[PDB]
Amino acid sequence: RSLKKGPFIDLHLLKKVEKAVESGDKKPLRTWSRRSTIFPNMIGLTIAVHNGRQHVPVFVTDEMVGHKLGEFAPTRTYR
Amino acid sequence: AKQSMKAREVKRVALADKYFAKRAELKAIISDVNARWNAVLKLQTLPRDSSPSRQRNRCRQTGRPHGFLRKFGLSRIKVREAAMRGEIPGLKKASW
Amino acid sequence: RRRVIGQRKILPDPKFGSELLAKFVNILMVDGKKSTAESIVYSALETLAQRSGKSELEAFEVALENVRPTVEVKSRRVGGSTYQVPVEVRPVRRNALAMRWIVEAARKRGDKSMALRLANELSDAAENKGTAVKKREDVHRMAEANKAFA
Amino acid sequence: ARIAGINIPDHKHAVIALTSIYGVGKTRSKAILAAAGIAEDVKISELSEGQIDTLRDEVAKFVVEGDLRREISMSIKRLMDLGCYRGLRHRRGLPVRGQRTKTNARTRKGPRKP
Amino acid sequence: RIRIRLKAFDHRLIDQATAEIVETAKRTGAQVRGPIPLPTRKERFTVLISPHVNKDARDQYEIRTHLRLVDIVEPTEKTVDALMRLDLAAGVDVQISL
Amino acid sequence: NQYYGTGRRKSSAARVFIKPGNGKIVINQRSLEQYFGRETARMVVRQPLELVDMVEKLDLYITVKGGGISGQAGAIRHGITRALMEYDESLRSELRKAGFVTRDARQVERKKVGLRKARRRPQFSKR
RNA sequence: GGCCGGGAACUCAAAGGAGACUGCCAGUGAUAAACUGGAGGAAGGUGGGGAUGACGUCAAGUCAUCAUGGCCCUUACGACCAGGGCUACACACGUGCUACAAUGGCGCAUACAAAGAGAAGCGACCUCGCGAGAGCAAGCGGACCUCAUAAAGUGCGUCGUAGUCCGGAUUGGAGUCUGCAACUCGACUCCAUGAAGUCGGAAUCGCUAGUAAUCGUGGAUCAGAAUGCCACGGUGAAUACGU
RNA sequence: UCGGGCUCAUAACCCGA
RNA sequence: AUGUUU
Ligand SMILES: [Mg+2]
Numbered sequence: 060r061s062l063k064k065g066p067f068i069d070l071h072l073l074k075k076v077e078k079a080v081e082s083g084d085k086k087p088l089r090t091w092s093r094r095s096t097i098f099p100n101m102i103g104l105t106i107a108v109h110n111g112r113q114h115v116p117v118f119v120t121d122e123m124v125g126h127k128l129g130e131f132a133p134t135r136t137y138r
Numbered sequence: 139a140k141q142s143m144k145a146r147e148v149k150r151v152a153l154a155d156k157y158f159a160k161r162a163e164l165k166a167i168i169s170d171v172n173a174r175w176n177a178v179l180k181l182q183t184l185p186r187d188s189s190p191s192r193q194r195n196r197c198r199q200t201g202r203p204h205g206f207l208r209k210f211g212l213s214r215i216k217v218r219e220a221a222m223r224g225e226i227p228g229l230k231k232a233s234w
Numbered sequence: 235r236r237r238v239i240g241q242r243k244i245l246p247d248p249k250f251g252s253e254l255l256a257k258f259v260n261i262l263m264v265d266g267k268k269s270t271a272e273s274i275v276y277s278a279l280e281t282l283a284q285r286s287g288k289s290e291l292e293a294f295e296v297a298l299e300n301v302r303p304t305v306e307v308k309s310r311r312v313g314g315s316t317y318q319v320p321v322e323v324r325p326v327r328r329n330a331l332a333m334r335w336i337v338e339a340a341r342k343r344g345d346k347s348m349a350l351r352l353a354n355e356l357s358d359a360a361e362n363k364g365t366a367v368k369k370r371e372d373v374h375r376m377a378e379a380n381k382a383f384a
Numbered sequence: 385a386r387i388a389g390i391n392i393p394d395h396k397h398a399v400i401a402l403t404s405i406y407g408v409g410k411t412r413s414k415a416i417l418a419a420a421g422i423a424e425d426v427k428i429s430e431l432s433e434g435q436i437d438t439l440r441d442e443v444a445k446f447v448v449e450g451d452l453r454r455e456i457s458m459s460i461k462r463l464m465d466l467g468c469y470r471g472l473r474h475r476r477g478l479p480v481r482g483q484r485t486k487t488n489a490r491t492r493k494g495p496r497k498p
Numbered sequence: 499r500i501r502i503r504l505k506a507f508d509h510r511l512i513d514q515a516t517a518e519i520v521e522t523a524k525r526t527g528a529q530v531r532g533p534i535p536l537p538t539r540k541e542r543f544t545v546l547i548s549p550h551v552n553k554d555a556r557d558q559y560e561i562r563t564h565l566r567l568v569d570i571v572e573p574t575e576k577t578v579d580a581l582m583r584l585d586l587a588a589g590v591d592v593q594i595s596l
Numbered sequence: 597n598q599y600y601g602t603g604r605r606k607s608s609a610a611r612v613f614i615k616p617g618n619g620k621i622v623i624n625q626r627s628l629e630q631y632f633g634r635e636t637a638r639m640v641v642r643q644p645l646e647l648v649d650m651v652e653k654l655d656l657y658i659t660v661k662g663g664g665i666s667g668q669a670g671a672i673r674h675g676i677t678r679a680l681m682e683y684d685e686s687l688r689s690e691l692r693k694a695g696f697v698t699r700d701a702r703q704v705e706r707k708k709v710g711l712r713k714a715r716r717r718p719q720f721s722k723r
Numbered sequence: 724g725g726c727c728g729g730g731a732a733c734u735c736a737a738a739g740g741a742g743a744c745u746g747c748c749a750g751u752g753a754u755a756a757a758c759u760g761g762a763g764g765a766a767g768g769u770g771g772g773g774a775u776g777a778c779g780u781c782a783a784g785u786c787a788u789c790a791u792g793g794c795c796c797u798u799a800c801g802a803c804c805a806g807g808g809c810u811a812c813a814c815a816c817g818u819g820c821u822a823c824a825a826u827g828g829c830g831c832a833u834a835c836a837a838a839g840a841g842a843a844g845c846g847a848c849c850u851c852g853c854g855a856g857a858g859c860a861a862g863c864g865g866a867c868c869u870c871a872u873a874a875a876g877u878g879c880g881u882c883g884u885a886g887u888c889c890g891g892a893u894u895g896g897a898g899u900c901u902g903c904a905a906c907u908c909g910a911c912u913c914c915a916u917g918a919a920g921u922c923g924g925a926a927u928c929g930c931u932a933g934u935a936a937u938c939g940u941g942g943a944u945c946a947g948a949a950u951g952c953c954a955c956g957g958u959g960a961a962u963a964c965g966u
Numbered sequence: 967u968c969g970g971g972c973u974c975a976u977a978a979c980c981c982g983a
Numbered sequence: 984a985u986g987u988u989u
Pocket residue numbers: 140141
């Protein structure tokens with residue numbers, strides 16, 4: 060999130076997301092970069108953020124921007 | 139230490155003597171307000187296992203990634219141990 | 235333990251001249267800010283002036299006389315039991331005991347400034363009242379009530 | 385009338401008193417005072433009507449007391465409706481801003497039950 | 499003029515050093531500011547001895563780096579190399595620039 | 597004549613300028629009270645003069661360098677004393693008697709590696 | 724304007740020394756040692772602080788610094804990469820930091836130290852920014868410049884013993900930067916919020932003097948995250964019969 | 967009963983709930 | 984009081 064002027068992102072995904080967005084849709088996109096700022100273009104895309112074991116398919120609304128896939132994805136355990 | 143690790147680190151060093159040795163700024167100037175695109179900043183996938191902040195020290199003599207001394211290069215054990223003999227010019231045990 | 239010492243005196247009164255008085259400024263002094271101690275132990279008498287009148291010099295010691303004890307007890311274990319054998323304190327620590335207990339209550343006044351929180355007790359002695367003067371005779375209680383000892 | 389809305393803390397220095405206004409600190413307090421020529425100090429006794437009613441015109445320009453606390457109470461809710469860490473941690477009564485959860489935590493989760 | 503900042507981990511490379519350094523160019527006499535003592539940059543270095551725990555031990559050291567000024571004023575070309583060329587020194591360090 | 601007074605103690609180092617006559621002091625482009633004055637009993641500068649007078653007798657204009665407050669002025673004390681020998685190298689036996697000629701040997705204490713402050717050490721409950 | 728020349732007087736710097744040794748005086752004391760006072764001296768009776776840790780004990784600690792007897796793994800207990808974790812929590816303990824406040828808080832102006840730091844470094848100056856800081860760019864490899872603008876303290880405005888003009892946790896929104904990269908897990912700033920807490924049970928620790936106590940300063944490690952460690956000075960006590 | 971302290975450690979003892 | 988644990 061905190062990225063002053065020009066947030067950070069991992070090209071690895073950019074060349075996978077929109078790369079598959081143009082042609083309708085298909086199977087969930089296995090992400091991995093929890094340190095990447097959610098893109099307002101990957102809207103409700105069928106993906107999945109890695110949690111250190113598997114990936115959790117989550118979507119962002121018109122209220123999540125500076126956040127990263129990490130936020131909407133647990134990486135620990137308790138209770 | 140551990141030769142297997144020592145070497146693994148050696149790689150993290152040479153890479154700087156290459157990519158960071160100069161091309162580090164070849165994109166830097168295009169990173170800070172110097173208009174200014176984003177393409178370079180976007181296709182920024184050159185410095186991976188390479189980073190001017192991922193190189194550890196480890197006692198030069200041995201290889202302990204802790205208790206390092208810039209003025210020297212070894213760790214507390216070796217340094218002290220060596221200084222005792224005299225492999226360091228002007229390094230008598232301090233005592234104000 | 236096996237050695238003996240004398241005493242650790244220092245620079246007396248800034249002008250009124252009074253070695254022991256320094257203690258009242260030191261004993262009260264905290265955080266090693268003697269620079270401020272002189273601001274309280276001195277300004278104090280400057281307030282008791284109208285309060286009492288006669289030389290603030292005497293004013294102090296005057297009421298101070300009704301605060302300094304003259305007999306205390308020291309725990310001494312014997313055959314399992316630890317008696318509270320009494321003992322008449324010499325002047326040296328006597329005057330001291332007072333100052334300690336004196337400055338203490340003064341800082342327990344719980345009002346506003348210490349300048350006043352100090353004068354109050356400085357005069358409360360003569361007129362009799364306060365926590366400071368309390369201890370004075372309060373100590374006498376334990377005293378003699380144990381005369382069966384010393 | 386109540387300086388800006390409910391509760392009229394009077395008989396106290398301008399600023400220090402204005403601080404009683406739920407939504408203004410030692411900064412936003414003095415800043416607006418100068419915009420009215422009001423003396424950041426002195427009791428409100430020496431003040432006058434024009435030294436209070438006008439302070440509202442500008443105080444309203446900013447969301448305070450009322451909607452403010454509601455705004456924040458909602459912020460907390462907005463930060464939960466989503467299965468995101470920050471938003472989730474904001475529910476189990478545990479802290480959500482880099483803090484150990486093994487020692488010293490009797491603030492976000494109140495006192496312990498020994 | 500030419501300066502000569504000295505710096506060594508002992509007087510050995512200074513005592514009988516700076517001296518000759520002065521009576522070298524001026525085989526008979528010359529200006530030259532002359533030798534001087536100056537302060538002493540000291541870098542205390544402390545380290546833990548016993549391995550594993552026992553951080554309460556430690557052993558401190560200090561590399562005493564001495565220095566001298568000197569500096570020649572009159573660059574008598576007849577004595578210039580009479581000091582430069584005669585640059586022996588058992589491994590010291592004396593700067594020279596203006 | 598242009599006398600001299602070490603007056604260098606407790607990390608401080610003054611220069612007692614004992615001039616002929618004029619008991620006026622002007623340390624660091626300012627007078628006694630026009631500096632450290634009104635902060636401590638620094639008036640102890642005349643303390644030494646309290647054995648043979650001053651004013652028209654001699655001058656006590658000084659100027660200290662380095663050290664702490666009570667140190668600077670305090671240094672002058674131990675200095676002025678010895679700084680009066682040029683007026684009577686035999687009157688010195690009238691200053692030490694009141695703590696003067698003797699330099700304040702008391703200074704800070706080197707912090708020892710292992711103690712909170714070269715004397716005090718952390719507590720040990722589970723000891 | 725130590726700003727010019729100039730002067731080498733002064734502090735200072737720092738290599739070589741001078742010095743303290745029951746050495747001298749008296750008493751005591753076996754007219755022994757030694758002790759107790761004295762003089763002289765900056766310094767007295769191992770001057771103060773360092774470093775230095777006997778033969779050994781706890782089969783005390785460290786195969787994880789490293790070395791090494793044996794033993795063990797050998798498409799692996801070897802090796803490389805990405806993400807996660809060591810930064811969990813329903814609790815408990817140790818060492819710490821900050822307050823609970825007027826010997827105080829905040830606004831003004833102001834008074835003074837010591838020791839260290841530094842070319843992928845310290846970075847002045849001036850511009851813009853509330854601000855972190857960003858831009859420009861000199862100087863110093865350094866008793867030459869930058870770090871460096873000590874803090875307590877001092878004199879005024881004030882506030883009046885209120886949980887406040889105290890205290891600062893917490894949290895929300897907005898930002899800066901160090902970095903591929905700061906959700907997981909970074910330091911700082913801006914505004915808003917303002918915690919518990921009013922001096923702490925049984926119990927328990929430290930400290931004999933420039934000590935305790937308090938107030939600041941620098942270093943190391945180090946891209947960027949010190950309430951820690953190491954070191955420096957400012958100021959600056961009480962008390963000590965006695966075992 | 968539990969949580970803390972006391973001891974080298976238990977119990978006991980002390981504190982708190 | 985005990986410790987192979989009042
Ligand atoms: Mg190996």
